[PDB]
Amino acid sequence: VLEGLDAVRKRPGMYIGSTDGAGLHHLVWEIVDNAVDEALSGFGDRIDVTINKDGSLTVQDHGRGMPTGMHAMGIPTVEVIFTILHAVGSSVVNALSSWLEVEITRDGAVYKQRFENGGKPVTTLKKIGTALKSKTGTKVTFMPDATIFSTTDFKYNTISERLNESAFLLKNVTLSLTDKRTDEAIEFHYEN
Amino acid sequence: QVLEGLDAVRKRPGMYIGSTDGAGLHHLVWEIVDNAVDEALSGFGDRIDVTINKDGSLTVQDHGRGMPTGMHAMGIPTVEVIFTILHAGVGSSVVNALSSWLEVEITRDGAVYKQRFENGGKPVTTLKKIGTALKSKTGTKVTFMPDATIFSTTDFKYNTISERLNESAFLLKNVTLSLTDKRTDEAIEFHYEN
Ligand SMILES: CCNC(=O)Nc1cc(-c2nc(C(F)(F)F)cs2)c(-c2cc(-c3n[nH]c(=O)o3)cnc2N2[C@@H]3CC[C@H]2CN(C)C3)cn1
Numbered sequence: 202v203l204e205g206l207d208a209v210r211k212r213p214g215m216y217i218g219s220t221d222g223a224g225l226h227h228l229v230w231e232i233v234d235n236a237v238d239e240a241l242s243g244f245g246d247r248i249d250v251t252i253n254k255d256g257s258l259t260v261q262d263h264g265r266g267m268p269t270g271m272h273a274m275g276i277p278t279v280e281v282i283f284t285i286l287h288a289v290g291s292s293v294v295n296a297l298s299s300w301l302e303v304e305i306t307r308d309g310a311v312y313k314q315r316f317e318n319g320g321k322p323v324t325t326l327k328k329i330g331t332a333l334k335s336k337t338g339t340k341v342t343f344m345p346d347a348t349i350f351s352t353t354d355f356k357y358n359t360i361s362e363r364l365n366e367s368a369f370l371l372k373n374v375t376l377s378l379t380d381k382r383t384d385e386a387i388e389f390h391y392e393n
Numbered sequence: 394q395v396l397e398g399l400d401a402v403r404k405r406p407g408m409y410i411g412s413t414d415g416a417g418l419h420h421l422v423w424e425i426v427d428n429a430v431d432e433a434l435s436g437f438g439d440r441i442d443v444t445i446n447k448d449g450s451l452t453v454q455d456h457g458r459g460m461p462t463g464m465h466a467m468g469i470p471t472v473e474v475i476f477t478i479l480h481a482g483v484g485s486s487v488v489n490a491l492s493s494w495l496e497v498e499i500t501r502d503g504a505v506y507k508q509r510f511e512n513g514g515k516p517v518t519t520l521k522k523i524g525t526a527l528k529s530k531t532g533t534k535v536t537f538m539p540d541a542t543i544f545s546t547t548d549f550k551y552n553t554i555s556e557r558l559n560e561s562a563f564l565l566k567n568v569t570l571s572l573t574d575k576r577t578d579e580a581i582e583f584h585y586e587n
C-alpha cells in the first residue's frame with residue numbers, strides 16, 4: 202500500500218525517530234545513504250556534502266544520476282521517488298523539508314525539479330542545461346522544515362564523524378564535508 | 394619608477410581604465426580575469442569561474458597556485474603590496490582603487506587565507522588564515538564591488554561579460570571559462586580544443 206508525504210508529516214517520529222537534533226541529522230543520512238549505495242554499485246568515487254550559508258544542506262555524488270524518464274500521467278520518475286512513499290528515504294526528507302531541489306546530470310543534459318512546503322512539486326523535471334557526456338550525477342539540496350524540527354542547525358562534528366565511518370566501510374571512495382558558514386572543510390578516505 | 398598610492402587612481406580613473414561609464418566598468422572585469430588567464434597560461438589551472446553575485450559584486454576564481462601568502466617588509470603581506478601600491482602587474486591595484494570594497498581569498502596547502510579592503514582599496518584587515526581546505530585544492534578568488542561614487546553605472550552586463558570570456562577561451566584553448574549570473578540564475582561555459 203502506497204502513501205503520500207502528508208503521512209510522514211502527520212507522524213514524523215515514526216519515520217525518522219524524532220524531531221530534535223538527532224532526527225534532523227537522520228535527514229542527512231538518508232540522502233547520503235543513496236549516494237553511498239551508488240558508489241557501492243560502482244558509480245562515483247566521491248560524495249561531497251555541503252552545509253550552506255542559508256542553513257540548507259547539499260549532497261552531490263558522481264553516479265549515473267537518478268532516472269530522467271516519465272511514468273504515468275506524464276509524471277517524472279524522480280517525482281515518484283520523492284513524493285510517493287512505499288510504506289523510501291528520499292520522499293521522507295522531502296516531506297520534512299520546507300523546500301528541496303534535485304539536479305540530475307546525464308546524457309549531456311542537466312535536469313532539475315524543485316519541491317516546496319513538505320514536498321509539493323512547484324516545477325516539473327525540466328531540462329535546464331547541457332554538460333559533457335562524461336559528467337554524471339545527482340545533486341540533492343534540501344531545507345529542513347523549521348515548523349517540524351526543534352532545531353534546523355546542522356552540526357559540523359556530527360556529520361563529520363558519520364562520513365568518516367561511511368568512508369571506512371565503503372573504501373576507495375572519498376566523502377567530503379564543507380561548511381560555508383565557518384569556512385571549514387574535511388575529507389575522509391580509506392584504502393584496501 | 395616612482396611608486397604611488399591608490400588615491401592617484403581615484404583622482405583620475407579614466408587614465409587607468411579608459412572611462413567611468415559602462416565600458417570602463419567592464420574593464421575592471423578584464424583586469425582580474427587577465428591575471429587568472431596569465432596564471433593558466435603559465436601552466437597552472439585549467440578553469441576560470443566568473444560569478445555575478447546578487448549583491449551586485451563580481452567574483453573571479455581560478456585554480457592556479459594562488460597569490461603569495463608570505464610577508465614583505467614590516468610584516469606587510471605580499472598580496473597587500475599587489476593591491477595597494479601602484480607601479481606607475483598593475484591591474485590588481487587599479488581595480489581595488491575603484492572599488493567600495495574588495496576581497497582576496499587564497500587557498501593553498503589545505504588552508505584558506507583572506508584579506509579585505511574597503512573605500513578605494515584601504516585595507517581593513519591584514520592577511521589572516523580564516524579556514525581550512527583540501528590539500529588538493531589551490532587557487533585565488535577575488536571579489537569586488539565597484540565604487541558607485543566613481544562609476545556612472547555599476548550594473549554588470551551578462552551579455553558583455555559572456556562574449557569576452559568566449560573570445561578568451563578561443564585564444565587560450567584547453568581552458569574552461571565560465572560565467573554565472575546569480576541575479577537571474579543563468580550560466581554558460583566555453584572551452585576550445587587544439
Ligand atoms: C545525492 C543522492 N543521489 C542519489 O541518490 N543518486 C542516485 C539515486 C538512484 C536511485 N535512487 C532511487 C531511490 F531513491 F531509491 F528510489 C531510485 S534510483 C540511483 C540509481 C540509478 C540506477 C540507474 N540509473 N541508470 C540505470 O540504468 O540504473 C539504478 N539504481 C539506482 N539506485 C538504487 C540502487 C543504487 C542507487 C540508490 N539506491 C538506494 C537505489 C543512482 N543515483
Ligand SMILES: CCNC(=O)Nc1cc(-c2nc(C(F)(F)F)cs2)c(-c2cc(-c3n[nH]c(=O)o3)cnc2N2[C@@H]3CC[C@H]2CN(C)C3)cn1
Nearest residue numbers: 428429431432453454455457458459460475482485533535
Ligand atoms: C582571480 C585572479 N587570480 C589571480 O590573480 N591569480 C594569480 C595571481 C598571481 C600573481 N599575480 C601577481 C600580480 F598581480 F601581477 F602582482 C603577482 S602573483 C599568480 C602567480 C603566482 C606565482 C607564484 N606562486 N607561487 C610561486 O612560487 O609563484 C607566480 N606568478 C604568478 N603570476 C604572475 C605571472 C602569472 C601569474 C599572474 N600574473 C599576472 C602575475 C598566480 N595566480
